[PDB]
Amino acid sequence: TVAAYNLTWKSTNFKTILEWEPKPVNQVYTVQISTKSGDWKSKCFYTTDTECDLTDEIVKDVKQTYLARVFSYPAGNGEPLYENSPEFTPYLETNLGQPTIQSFEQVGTKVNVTVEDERTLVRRNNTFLSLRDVFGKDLIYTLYYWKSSSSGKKTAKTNTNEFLIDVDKGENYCFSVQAVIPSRTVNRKSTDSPVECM
Amino acid sequence: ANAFLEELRPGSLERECKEEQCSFEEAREIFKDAERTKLFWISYSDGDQCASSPCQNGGSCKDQLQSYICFCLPAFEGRNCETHKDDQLICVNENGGCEQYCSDHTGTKRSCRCHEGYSLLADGVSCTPTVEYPCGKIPILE
Amino acid sequence: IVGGKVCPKGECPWQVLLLVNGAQLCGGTLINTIWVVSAAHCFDKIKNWRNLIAVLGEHDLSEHDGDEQSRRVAQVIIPSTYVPGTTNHDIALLRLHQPVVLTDHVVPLCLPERTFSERTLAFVRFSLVSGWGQLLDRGATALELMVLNVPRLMTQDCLQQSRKVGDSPNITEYMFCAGYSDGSKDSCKGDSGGPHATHYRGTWYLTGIVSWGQGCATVGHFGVYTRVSQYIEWLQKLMRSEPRPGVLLRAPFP
Numbered sequence: 001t002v003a004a005y006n007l008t009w010k011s012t013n014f015k016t017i018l019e020w021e022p023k024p025v026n027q028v029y030t031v032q033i034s035t036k037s038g039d040w041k042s043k044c045f046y047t048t049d050t051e052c053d054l055t056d057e058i059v060k061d062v063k064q065t066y067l068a069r070v071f072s073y074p075a076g077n078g079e080p081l082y083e084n085s086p087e088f089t090p091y092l093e094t095n096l097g098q099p100t101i102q103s104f105e106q107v108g109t110k111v112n113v114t115v116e117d118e119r120t121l122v123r124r125n126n127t128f129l130s131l132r133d134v135f136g137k138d139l140i141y142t143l144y145y146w147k148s149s150s151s152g153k154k155t156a157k158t159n160t161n162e163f164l165i166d167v168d169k170g171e172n173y174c175f176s177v178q179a180v181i182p183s184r185t186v187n188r189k190s191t192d193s194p195v196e197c198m
Numbered sequence: 199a200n201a202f203l204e205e206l207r208p209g210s211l212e213r214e215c216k217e218e219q220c221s222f223e224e225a226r227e228i229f230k231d232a233e234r235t236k237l238f239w240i241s242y243s244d245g246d247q248c249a250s251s252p253c254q255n256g257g258s259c260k261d262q263l264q265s266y267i268c269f270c271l272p273a274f275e276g277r278n279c280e281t282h283k284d285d286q287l288i289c290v291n292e293n294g295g296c297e298q299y300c301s302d303h304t305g306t307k308r309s310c311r312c313h314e315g316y317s318l319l320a321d322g323v324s325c326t327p328t329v330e331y332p333c334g335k336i337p338i339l340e
Numbered sequence: 341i342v343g344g345k346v347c348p349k350g351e352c353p354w355q356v357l358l359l360v361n362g363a364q365l366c367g368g369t370l371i372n373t374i375w376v377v378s379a380a381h382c383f384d385k386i387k388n389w390r391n392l393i394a395v396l397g398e399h400d401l402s403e404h405d406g407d408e409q410s411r412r413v414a415q416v417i418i419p420s421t422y423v424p425g426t427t428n429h430d431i432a433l434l435r436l437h438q439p440v441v442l443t444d445h446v447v448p449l450c451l452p453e454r455t456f457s458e459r460t461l462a463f464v465r466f467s468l469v470s471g472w473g474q475l476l477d478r479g480a481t482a483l484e485l486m487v488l489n490v491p492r493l494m495t496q497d498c499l500q501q502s503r504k505v506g507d508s509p510n511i512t513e514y515m516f517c518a519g520y521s522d523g524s525k526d527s528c529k530g531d532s533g534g535p536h537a538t539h540y541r542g543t544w545y546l547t548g549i550v551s552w553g554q555g556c557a558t559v560g561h562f563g564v565y566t567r568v569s570q571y572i573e574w575l576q577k578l579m580r581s582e583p584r585p586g587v588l589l590r591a592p593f594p
């Protein structure tokens with residue numbers, strides 16, 4: 001057998017997939033995951049894939065710190081060869097999903113811009129929780145907007161999923177939004193939403 | 199996006215880009231600014247990665263930049279919801295849910311067994327003592 | 341045991357104290373009413389083979405109470421492959437001359453099937469180790485039975501996390517590491533032969549035997565325990581064998 005290598009956590013909105021190399025040649029893999037003090041749970045038994053969905057184990061506690069390891073077994077079938085993953089803490093490290101502007105509405109001399117609730121893989125009682133359900137006050141949304149006839153850009157920030165911004169009357173404005181966890185120093189922002197204009 | 203009589207008006211994002219497909223330069227002429235144009239184009243030209251319907255087993259797809267996320271029904275997992283939880287009843291998966299011993303039976307269901315001093319309950323997995331002091335239990339607690 | 345707790349009386353009811361000429365020798369584990377598992381190395385210096393006693397139901401070595409049961413050891417069975425003074429195949433199977441009586445203070449630990457032990461019990465992170473060994477490396481032994489929770493490592497991790505020591509023993513397929521590298525908690529010499537016991541879904545099982553280490557609770561080192569899963573078939577066959585006339589038997593392995 002050969003040991004797995006380049007083990008990498010791919011995780012967005014808690015959908016979390018461990019990836020590794022190499023493509024198997026006369027070997028198969030099984031993955032195990034644990035927390036530092038907990039038991040090892042096996043996943044992806046004898047797979048020929050070079051990936052393993054671990055979402056269902058990590059959503060049980062997103063604030064825990066998980067370690068995974070990938071075992072290599074020779075085809076047809078001591079301790080096996082294996083490689084450990086980086087540690088992963090999902091609340092701290094999951095990517096924030098690309099957001100969508102849900103609506104905008106002219107009310108007064110102002111425009112409300114509403115961000116669609118971002119759905120995550122964490123379940124509560126047959127429902128997927130939103131990013132704001134999971135992160136609460138650690139999550140903000142940021143709005144990049146401009147008046148088309150002007151140079152330069154404006155930004156607003158919200159603790160909810162809505163922005164109420166002042167606009168000059170009879171003018172068109174375009175908008176784009178990001179999810180942000182300001183307390184992070186790495187992977188602090190989603191990609192920008194598609195741009196929507198009046 | 200060219201048909202000559204339809205080209206008579208000044209630029210319109212609605213006309214050029216939302217009712218029709220526009221090229222990067224057409225969008226640039228509308229937005230003018232480099233970063234405003236970039237912000238729009240990065241998403242507009244990205245495509246819907248959910249269009250190929252990658253989520254299996256009744257999962258739901260959400261589009262992202264050059265990527266998607268599948269949200270699975272409870273009985274499924276995997277990047278594309280391809281793994282049936284119901285088909286993973288095997289001994290290396292949490293001891294096949296057996297309390298004590300687990301035996302794989304290929305083609306058919308695994309079975310559960312017990313150590314001497316115990317017998318297998320009607321439930322097919324759980325074990326009960328058949329003697330006063332079975333091995334491996336601490337009676338002073340119970 | 342270094343950095344453990346007193347095992348409340350009766351809570352480690354499979355623990356065995358072995359004596360030779362009435363003096364503390366080693367620990368062991370009761371696995372049914374007649375058979376005890378201990379470490380081969382415990383026997384390297386024995387001259388008086390007919391003077392070995394197993395004590396069940398022991399707790400406090402300074403006071404007798406009515407829960408202790410002593411039985412003469414009739415046979416000590418060690419793999420032929422074991423070499424005195426070395427670490428590999430460090431296991432001994434002991435036949436008691438008369439059975440103990442099981443009581444609230446005297447209960448056997450389950451010896452598991454091999455495959456269950458390799459595929460399931462080996463991935464339960466923590467297990468308990470116990471004995472009346474030294475409370476510090478090169479220190480005095482304990483009068484009350486002591487118990488410690490230790491996490492298990494696969495051998496690759498144990499090699500990668502262990503300080504290099506010139507000419508140290510190999511960690512073989514017949515061993516595993518468990519414990520803590522930070523100098524705080526470990527089994528020790530006088531705990532040799534005692535159980536490393538693993539709890540799984542309401543039943544406790546024998547997974548290891550206290551065997552060796554670099555000192556006790558040395559920084560950069562784990563304890564090493566005989567990997568009992570490799571011996572299940574060997575033990576089960578020998579427990580079906582007829583007794584022989586002398587105490588020591590070296591039996592082929594596998």
Ligand SMILES: *[C@@H]1O[C@H](CO)[C@@H](O)[C@H](O)[C@H]1O
Nearest residue numbers: 246247248249250251252
């Ligand atoms: C279209 O569908 C395939 C799998 O069926 C997937 O690979 C793509 O990523 C998706 O957009």
Ligand SMILES: *[C@@H]1O[C@@H](C)[C@@H](O)[C@@H](O)[C@@H]1O
Nearest residue numbers: 256257258259269270271
């Ligand atoms: C999307 O989410 C998944 C979980 C299923 O409930 C689908 O029916 C829905 O469209």
Ligand SMILES: [Ca+2]
Nearest residue numbers: 204213214218
């Ligand atoms: Ca048109």
Ligand SMILES: [Ca+2]
Nearest residue numbers: 199213214218
């Ligand atoms: Ca056009």
Ligand SMILES: [Ca+2]
Nearest residue numbers: 209224227228
């Ligand atoms: Ca144009």
Ligand SMILES: [Ca+2]
Nearest residue numbers: 223224225227
């Ligand atoms: Ca043009």
Ligand SMILES: [Ca+2]
Nearest residue numbers: 245247262264
């Ligand atoms: Ca897309």
Ligand SMILES: [Ca+2]
Nearest residue numbers: 400401403404
């Ligand atoms: Ca006593």
Ligand SMILES: [Cl-]
Nearest residue numbers: 118130131132
């Ligand atoms: Cl949200």
Ligand SMILES: [Cl-]
Nearest residue numbers: 411412437438
């Ligand atoms: Cl006797």
Ligand SMILES: [Mg+2]
Nearest residue numbers: 212213216217
């Ligand atoms: Mg239109």
Ligand SMILES: [Mg+2]
Nearest residue numbers: 199214220224
């Ligand atoms: Mg045009």
Ligand SMILES: [Mg+2]
Nearest residue numbers: 223224226227
């Ligand atoms: Mg131009």
Ligand code: NA
Nearest residue numbers: 521523557558
């Ligand atoms: Na240590």
